[PDB]
Amino acid sequence: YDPRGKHCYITGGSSGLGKALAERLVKQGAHVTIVGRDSKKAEGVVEELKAIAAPGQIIQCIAADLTSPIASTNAIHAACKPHADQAPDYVYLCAGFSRPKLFVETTKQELKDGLDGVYWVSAYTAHEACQMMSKQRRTGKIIFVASYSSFSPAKYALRGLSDALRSEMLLHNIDIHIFLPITPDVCAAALESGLKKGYYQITD
Amino acid sequence: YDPRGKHCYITGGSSGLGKALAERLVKQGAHVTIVGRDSKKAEGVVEELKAIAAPGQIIQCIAADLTSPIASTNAIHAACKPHADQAPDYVYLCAGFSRPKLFVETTKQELKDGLDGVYWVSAYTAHEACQMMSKQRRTGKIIFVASYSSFSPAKYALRGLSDALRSEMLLHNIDIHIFLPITPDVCAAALESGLKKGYYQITD
């Protein structure tokens, strides 16, 4: 886990923990690609980080709804045209919304929306991510982030997919990790902490 | 947990564990409603069980894809027109398919299909189920069944929803349970076993 000079593709990088992670993955000296839906929100942060980058560091961003398989697929693909079609190395999955409610209060379309909102954002990407490194036959990491509710299912699903992959994808020699979390940049340290120390599961 | 004279609505009741459960929930003396997709498969089992029922026991079945919110919603509603619009008492969630594969091998549409296949079949029902007892303001139980992969997420999701509900729905005074499993009828005993003994989590 040496991030410097490495493509770091970070979903949800335009808000809390995801932005934080970019801040430092830059300070250290990576190529940092943030994804989000809000173009201005992200292209703002882009230039904020562009400031403190040393010249020649690719610091781009991409507007996409990562609840669409196609958007998820086109995004990661987009972010490597600059990087000579080199797959990313380190991929960070921080996209998420939390609009908490009561089961009985909730429409079925509300439930579907919340799973799409928390699971697939991470999963649809993670898929095409592996599919990329696999076929290019390169390595590098995939890092999931998790943590009245009824988003809970979606969080468990992530653990579920982490665990399935953390098995499987050591046939295509790909690291798999997951986070179980304080100013975001704190949690950011916890993560880089446990990552250099190689644990598959990481807390604060 | 006295099943006799109680509406027992059982998704996936036309195959393994779900059929088994009907066998005994009849032998004991319930009103038993099996749901499945295969009309002949189910209307077969229906009459098989109709044999061994004592007269006056409502033993019906319903063909529905429980991956549609509307099908899931119309089914449970259908199965209570005979039962004087009385919500079910005991609801058993055994619908499921397992078509195991490699992540890298899998299409994104394959993954979506597998979650729909294992989670929503149970969840879309469980929702309308509660929504029914809640608004009728009656009690009764909701029982989830769980247990290279990439159906794993969907299993974790169930545990996830079980856990969320097992909290929440003790505001609408509704029992919540879950199964973690041998001839199906074995597992069937394990379940009725731990259910009369009131544990929320049940193994074999």
Coordinates of N, CA and C in Angstrom, one line a residue, chain A residues 69 73 101-104 106 108 111-112 115 119-120 124 126-128 130-131 134 148-149 152-153 156-157 159-161 163-165 167-169 172, chain B residues 69 73 101-104 106 108 111-112 115 119-120 124 126-128 130-131 134 148-149 152-153 156-157 159-161 163-165 167-169 172:
Chain A
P69 N -25.9 0.8 -13.6 CA -24.8 0.0 -14.0 C -23.9 0.7 -15.1
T73 N -20.1 2.1 -15.0 CA -19.2 1.4 -15.9 C -18.5 2.5 -16.7
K101 N -35.9 6.3 8.3 CA -37.4 6.3 8.4 C -37.9 5.0 9.1
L102 N -39.2 4.9 9.3 CA -39.9 3.7 9.8 C -40.4 2.8 8.7
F103 N -40.0 1.5 8.8 CA -40.5 0.4 7.9 C -41.9 0.7 7.5
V104 N -42.9 0.7 8.5 CA -44.3 0.8 8.2 C -44.6 2.2 7.4
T106 N -42.6 3.6 5.3 CA -41.8 3.5 4.0 C -42.6 2.9 2.9
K108 N -42.6 0.9 -0.9 CA -41.7 -0.2 -1.4 C -40.7 0.5 -2.3
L111 N -37.9 1.8 -0.3 CA -36.9 0.8 0.2 C -36.0 0.4 -1.0
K112 N -36.5 0.2 -2.2 CA -35.7 -0.1 -3.4 C -34.7 1.0 -3.5
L115 N -31.6 0.9 -0.9 CA -30.6 -0.2 -1.2 C -29.8 0.3 -2.4
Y119 N -26.0 0.2 -1.4 CA -25.3 -1.0 -1.9 C -24.7 -0.8 -3.3
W120 N -25.6 -0.7 -4.3 CA -25.2 -0.8 -5.8 C -24.2 0.3 -6.1
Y124 N -21.9 -2.0 -8.1 CA -21.8 -1.9 -9.6 C -20.4 -1.4 -10.0
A126 N -17.4 -1.7 -7.9 CA -16.5 -2.9 -7.5 C -16.5 -4.0 -8.6
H127 N -17.6 -4.3 -9.2 CA -17.7 -5.3 -10.3 C -16.8 -4.9 -11.4
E128 N -17.2 -3.8 -12.1 CA -16.4 -3.3 -13.3 C -15.0 -3.1 -12.9
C130 N -13.0 -4.8 -10.6 CA -12.3 -6.2 -10.7 C -12.2 -6.6 -12.2
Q131 N -13.4 -6.7 -12.9 CA -13.5 -7.0 -14.3 C -12.4 -6.2 -15.1
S134 N -8.6 -7.7 -13.6 CA -8.7 -9.1 -14.0 C -8.2 -9.3 -15.4
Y148 N -36.3 2.4 12.4 CA -35.3 3.5 12.4 C -34.5 3.5 11.0
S149 N -33.7 2.4 10.8 CA -32.8 2.2 9.7 C -33.5 1.7 8.4
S152 N -29.6 -0.5 6.8 CA -29.0 -1.7 7.4 C -28.8 -2.8 6.5
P153 N -29.9 -3.4 5.9 CA -29.8 -4.4 4.9 C -28.6 -4.1 4.0
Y156 N -25.2 -4.5 5.4 CA -24.9 -5.9 5.6 C -24.5 -6.5 4.3
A157 N -25.2 -6.1 3.2 CA -25.0 -6.5 1.9 C -23.5 -6.3 1.5
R159 N -20.8 -5.8 3.6 CA -20.0 -6.8 4.3 C -20.1 -8.1 3.6
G160 N -21.3 -8.5 3.2 CA -21.6 -9.8 2.4 C -20.8 -9.9 1.2
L161 N -20.7 -8.8 0.4 CA -20.0 -8.8 -0.9 C -18.4 -8.7 -0.6
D163 N -16.9 -10.0 1.8 CA -16.6 -11.3 2.4 C -16.5 -12.3 1.2
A164 N -17.5 -12.3 0.3 CA -17.5 -13.2 -0.9 C -16.3 -12.9 -1.7
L165 N -16.0 -11.6 -2.0 CA -14.8 -11.2 -2.8 C -13.5 -11.6 -2.1
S167 N -12.7 -13.7 -0.2 CA -12.5 -15.1 -0.7 C -12.1 -15.0 -2.2
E168 N -13.0 -15.1 -3.1 CA -12.9 -15.2 -4.6 C -11.6 -14.6 -5.2
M169 N -11.5 -13.2 -4.9 CA -10.6 -12.4 -5.8 C -9.1 -12.5 -5.4
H172 N -7.6 -13.8 -8.5 CA -7.1 -12.8 -9.5 C -6.2 -11.9 -8.7
Chain B
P69 N -42.9 -5.8 -6.6 CA -43.6 -5.3 -5.4 C -45.1 -5.5 -5.5
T73 N -47.6 -7.8 -3.3 CA -48.6 -7.1 -2.6 C -50.0 -7.7 -2.9
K101 N -22.0 -18.7 -9.1 CA -21.0 -18.3 -10.2 C -19.8 -17.5 -9.6
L102 N -18.9 -17.1 -10.5 CA -17.8 -16.3 -10.2 C -18.1 -14.8 -10.5
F103 N -17.8 -13.9 -9.5 CA -17.9 -12.5 -9.6 C -17.5 -12.1 -11.1
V104 N -16.3 -12.3 -11.4 CA -15.7 -11.8 -12.7 C -16.5 -12.4 -13.9
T106 N -19.7 -13.0 -13.9 CA -21.1 -12.5 -13.8 C -21.3 -11.2 -14.5
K108 N -23.7 -7.6 -14.8 CA -24.3 -6.8 -13.8 C -25.7 -7.1 -13.6
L111 N -26.1 -10.1 -11.4 CA -26.0 -9.7 -10.0 C -27.4 -9.2 -9.5
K112 N -27.9 -8.2 -10.2 CA -29.2 -7.6 -9.8 C -30.2 -8.7 -9.7
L115 N -29.9 -10.9 -6.3 CA -30.4 -10.1 -5.1 C -31.9 -10.1 -5.1
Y119 N -33.3 -11.7 -1.8 CA -33.7 -10.6 -0.9 C -35.2 -10.3 -1.0
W120 N -35.5 -9.5 -2.1 CA -36.8 -8.9 -2.3 C -37.9 -9.9 -2.2
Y124 N -40.1 -7.6 0.0 CA -41.3 -7.0 -0.6 C -42.6 -7.5 0.2
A126 N -42.6 -9.3 3.4 CA -42.4 -8.8 4.8 C -43.0 -7.4 5.0
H127 N -42.7 -6.5 4.1 CA -43.2 -5.1 4.1 C -44.7 -5.1 4.2
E128 N -45.4 -5.5 3.1 CA -46.8 -5.5 3.0 C -47.4 -6.3 4.1
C130 N -46.3 -6.6 7.4 CA -46.3 -5.7 8.5 C -47.4 -4.6 8.3
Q131 N -47.2 -3.8 7.3 CA -48.2 -2.8 6.8 C -49.6 -3.4 7.0
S134 N -50.2 -4.1 11.2 CA -50.0 -2.7 11.7 C -51.4 -2.0 11.7
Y148 N -17.5 -17.6 -5.8 CA -18.4 -18.8 -5.7 C -19.8 -18.3 -5.5
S149 N -20.1 -17.5 -4.4 CA -21.5 -17.1 -4.0 C -21.9 -15.8 -4.8
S152 N -24.7 -14.3 -1.2 CA -24.2 -13.9 0.1 C -24.7 -12.5 0.5
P153 N -24.4 -11.5 -0.3 CA -24.9 -10.1 0.0 C -26.4 -10.3 0.4
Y156 N -27.1 -11.7 3.7 CA -26.7 -10.8 4.8 C -27.8 -9.7 4.9
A157 N -28.3 -9.3 3.7 CA -29.4 -8.2 3.7 C -30.5 -8.7 4.5
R159 N -30.7 -11.0 7.1 CA -30.2 -10.8 8.5 C -30.3 -9.3 8.9
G160 N -29.8 -8.4 8.0 CA -29.9 -7.0 8.2 C -31.3 -6.5 8.4
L161 N -32.3 -7.0 7.6 CA -33.7 -6.5 7.7 C -34.4 -7.1 8.9
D163 N -32.9 -7.8 11.7 CA -32.3 -7.1 12.8 C -33.0 -5.8 13.0
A164 N -33.1 -5.0 11.9 CA -33.8 -3.7 11.8 C -35.2 -3.9 12.4
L165 N -35.9 -4.8 11.8 CA -37.4 -5.1 12.2 C -37.4 -5.5 13.7
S167 N -35.8 -5.0 16.1 CA -36.0 -3.7 16.8 C -37.4 -3.1 16.5
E168 N -37.5 -2.3 15.5 CA -38.7 -1.4 15.1 C -40.0 -2.1 15.5
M169 N -40.3 -3.3 15.1 CA -41.7 -3.8 14.9 C -42.2 -4.3 16.3
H172 N -45.1 -2.1 17.0 CA -46.4 -2.6 16.5 C -46.6 -4.0 17.0

